[PDB]
Amino acid sequence: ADTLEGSMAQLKKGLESGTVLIQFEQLYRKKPGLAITFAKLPQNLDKNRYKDVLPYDTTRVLLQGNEDYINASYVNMEIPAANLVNKYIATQGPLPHTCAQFWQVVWDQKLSLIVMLTTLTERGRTKCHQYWPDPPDVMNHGGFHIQCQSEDCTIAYVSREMLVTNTQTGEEHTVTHLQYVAWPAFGVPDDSSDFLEFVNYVRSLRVDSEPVLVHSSAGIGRTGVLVTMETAMCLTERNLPIYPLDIVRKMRDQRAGMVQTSSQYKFVCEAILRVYEEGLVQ
């Protein structure tokens, strides 16, 4: 598998050609042979924000001891040479009637970090339900009370600390919630440097072995860019080869369609080169 420098030569060479973009367009969005059954059942159709963004049966997230369906997928990115696995749950922006299941996932797995890569609305249309209350209010979702204890806006994202109370048992759990608001659907981040800083910030907030919950509107486009970038950061820092196409394929084997547009792939490939060359010593 060659080396970081070699893979980086090939990537910059291939961006010039550009074979890297041709090979992206050739890649399947949906892995052939992977069953998608539960997502299309009558009771589940309106639990999908988009008709064509559905979880595979093999990687779909199940609620513990609870039959309710949710459009969410486990996505794990391995870096074998580093004995490292970065775990994610990739999901859509909740609908009004899916907030209960979203918070159940957070509770089940005591997830401490949610990364939301969308605004609530775009162009007068709702892209994600507001599944948390404006402080100081308290919301009930499916027998979870949710309150926002802290809310602070930076340039490009909002940082919120949320308290989740299980009303059945009286137990509570705290979650950090990062909402990246400067990144429109089917496009690239408004500022590349804000994006790279945000990814590295997310990396720093990981808790050992705990998946990061990541969502956008569909949970594949902007989410796929973020996952690709975190993977690449880990690889560059360890002097290991980076093949973006292998990374996208690996995500797509776990949730169809990750990285929605060619423009997004080109963005992430360029950002990978940028980070490599910024960090390069000699």
């Binding site: 089917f186 509107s217 369609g257 547009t261």
Partner: peptide, 8 residues
């Protein structure tokens, strides 16, 4: 039910 848009 709608597909995930890639345009306006």
């Amino acid at each position: 039910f709608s597909a995930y848009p890639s345009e306006e």
